[PDB]
Amino acid sequence: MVLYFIGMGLYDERDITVKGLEIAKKCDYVFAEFYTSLMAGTTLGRIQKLIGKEIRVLSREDVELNFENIVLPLAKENDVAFLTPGDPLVATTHAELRIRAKRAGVESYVIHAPSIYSAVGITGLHIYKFGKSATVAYPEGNWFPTSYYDVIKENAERGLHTLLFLDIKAEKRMYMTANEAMELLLKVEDMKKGGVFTDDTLVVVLARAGSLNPTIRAGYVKDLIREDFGDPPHILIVPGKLHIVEAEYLVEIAGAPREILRVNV
Amino acid sequence: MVLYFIGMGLYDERDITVKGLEIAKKCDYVFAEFYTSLMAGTTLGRIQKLIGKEIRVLSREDVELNFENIVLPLAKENDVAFLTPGDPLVATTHAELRIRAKRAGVESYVIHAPSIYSAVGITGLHIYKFGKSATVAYPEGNWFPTSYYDVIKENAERGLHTLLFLDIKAEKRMYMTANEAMELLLKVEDMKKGGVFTDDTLVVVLARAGSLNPTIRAGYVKDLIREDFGDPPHILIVPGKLHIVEAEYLVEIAGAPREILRVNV
Numbered sequence: 459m460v461l462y463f464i465g466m467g468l469y470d471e472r473d474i475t476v477k478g479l480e481i482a483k484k485c486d487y488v489f490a491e492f493y494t495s496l497m498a499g500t501t502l503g504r505i506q507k508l509i510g511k512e513i514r515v516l517s518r519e520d521v522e523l524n525f526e527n528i529v530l531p532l533a534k535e536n537d538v539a540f541l542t543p544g545d546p547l548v549a550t551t552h553a554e555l556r557i558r559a560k561r562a563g564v565e566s567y568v569i570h571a572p573s574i575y576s577a578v579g580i581t582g583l584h585i586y587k588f589g590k591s592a593t594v595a596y597p598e599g600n601w602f603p604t605s606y607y608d609v610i611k612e613n614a615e616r617g618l619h620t621l622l623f624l625d626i627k628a629e630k631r632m633y634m635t636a637n638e639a640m641e642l643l644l645k646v647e648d649m650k651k652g653g654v655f656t657d658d659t660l661v662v663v664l665a666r667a668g669s670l671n672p673t674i675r676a677g678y679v680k681d682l683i684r685e686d687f688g689d690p691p692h693i694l695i696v697p698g699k700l701h702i703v704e705a706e707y708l709v710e711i712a713g714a715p716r717e718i719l720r721v722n723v
Numbered sequence: 724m725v726l727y728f729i730g731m732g733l734y735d736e737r738d739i740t741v742k743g744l745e746i747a748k749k750c751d752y753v754f755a756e757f758y759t760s761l762m763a764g765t766t767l768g769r770i771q772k773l774i775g776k777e778i779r780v781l782s783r784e785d786v787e788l789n790f791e792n793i794v795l796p797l798a799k800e801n802d803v804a805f806l807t808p809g810d811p812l813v814a815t816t817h818a819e820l821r822i823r824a825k826r827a828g829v830e831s832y833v834i835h836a837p838s839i840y841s842a843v844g845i846t847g848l849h850i851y852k853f854g855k856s857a858t859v860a861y862p863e864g865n866w867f868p869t870s871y872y873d874v875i876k877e878n879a880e881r882g883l884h885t886l887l888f889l890d891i892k893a894e895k896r897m898y899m900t901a902n903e904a905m906e907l908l909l910k911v912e913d914m915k916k917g918g919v920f921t922d923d924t925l926v927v928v929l930a931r932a933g934s935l936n937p938t939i940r941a942g943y944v945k946d947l948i949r950e951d952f953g954d955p956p957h958i959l960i961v962p963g964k965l966h967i968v969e970a971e972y973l974v975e976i977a978g979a980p981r982e983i984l985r986v987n988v
């Protein structure tokens with residue numbers, strides 16, 4: 459009787475750690491969700507094939523309202539695994555599920571996997587220089603989210619980089635592109651006018667991290683806002699003050715304008 | 724003609740991803756470094772047996788000063804793998820290595836793995852609330868660095884959490900414990916008296932992340948400063964003001980005192 463929170467990683471079924479795979483293979487029941495992120499390089503079939511078990515996919519409602527009714531009951535008499543994209547506890551509310559497990563007398567263990575949060579390292583930006591992170595959320599009806607704009611501003615004043623997770627509506631199959639995130643940010647800039655995000659702002663786009671050929675691009679909003687970065691998932695990053703080697707990397711690897719090599723100390 | 728930056732993960736040889744293991748097995752030559760960090764839950768022998776290849780260890784100088792003379796030459800006519808603890812390119816200087824590859828006409832791909840940057844999510848603290856990160860260094864001689872103290876201050880001031888890496892002497896295999904980190908910070912507080920780190924400061928300790936039995940403890944400095952958190956590596960976190968949900972996880976999972984439910988929320 460035990461519950462394992464196992465991350466499947468960034469892009470495909472092979473992004474799971476060996477630890478996670480060997481443990482999953484031996485579990486009596488295997489559950490999973492695919493609404494907290496998008497694994498663009500795999501399918502349930504390949505995952506099931508790899509694990510050798512039938513996987514039951516849970517919806518956000520199943521998890522958020524019925525985890526203790528669907529999963530925990532089985533964990534009391536068996537070994538259960540709950541799979542999620544990337545790392546199970548990063549930018550999700552799955553951590554709270556460990557409390558529910560506890561209160562049900564079920565021991566839980568966490569098996570990490572590569573996460574988008576650390577994969578930003580591939581952009582060449584020093585990961586220790588990232589500040590507070592935020593999520594660019596799709597406006598809905600008359601409600602237009604904007605706090606993420608304030609995060610960029612706060613980080614920028616401190617010279618820190620800003621990681622922007624992009625919205626996702628799995629059931630509607632909606633995956634926010636970096637382009638849409640940029641459009642929303644310009645609209646918020648027009649609203650607040652803090653000179654935080656404009657056509658001249660340098661940004662970095664990372665798409666489908668985890669694949670052998672992710673899309674890594676850096677440049678000014680005016681030039682990237684309409685560029686095709688390939689299929690989702692995408693994340694947008696607004697760098698703060700750059701170190702020379704960061705700029706060098708963005709130019710050499712992410713095709714940024716050579717002019718950014720000239721940093722303003 | 725191809726260099727593969729492959730992450731070994733957090734704690735033991737099984738923290739590498741299935742993708743990383745399979746690719747490593749197809750490489751003609753396999754290099755690894757254990758100076759940016761160490762896999763306390765395994766050995767070079769166990770990693771070699773898992774990969775089924777002989778692994779050549781590289782020192783910090785081998786990499787920083789001679790990467791292009793030791794690794795790249797072979798990558799020109801073979802498939803080569805460069806293994807590192809955690810997720811590749813997280814270590815500040817590693818991304819630049821890809822520029823060296825490009826310059827040498829060598830293709831490079833990144834195979835991600837679990838990083839402490841995302842693994843700390845197991846402490847229950849929301850990942851988006853983490854601010855700038857820092858490393859607590861041992862003072863020595865006339866040198867007493869304290870910038871990490873200022874990082875905590877700026878972060879906590881904005882309600883952000885601070886991830887603190889503890890000093891490590893790879894070659895000498897000596898790790899700074901969370902206990903030593905706390906003592907050091909109290910000492911720094913005594914000199915700067917900014918009211919940033921005191922006996923009443925709430926801290927979180929994460930030890931052996933990646934292991935199936937990690938140590939996750941949360942409490943006030945006065946009660947944790949002499950507690951035994953087990954074997955290294957240790958990571959110290961100074962949380963900013965907590966979301967009730969974070970506080971609850973810390974109490975139920977990290978054994979934190981109920982007092983934080985009213986004092987630090």
Ligand SMILES: Nc1ncnc2c1ncn2[C@@H]1O[C@H](CSCC[C@H](N)C(=O)O)[C@@H](O)[C@H]1O
Pocket residue numbers: 468469494495496543544545546547548549550572573574575622623624625626664665666667668691692693841
């Ligand atoms: N492989 C990938 N490439 C680019 N962005 C990704 C990504 N995986 C996740 N994301 C980003 O993060 C959002 C999901 S947030 C959940 C993250 C997950 N627990 C993890 O550990 O990665 C997506 O909407 C997207 O903006």
Ligand code: NA
Pocket residue numbers: 585586588589840853854856
């Ligand atoms: Na961070």
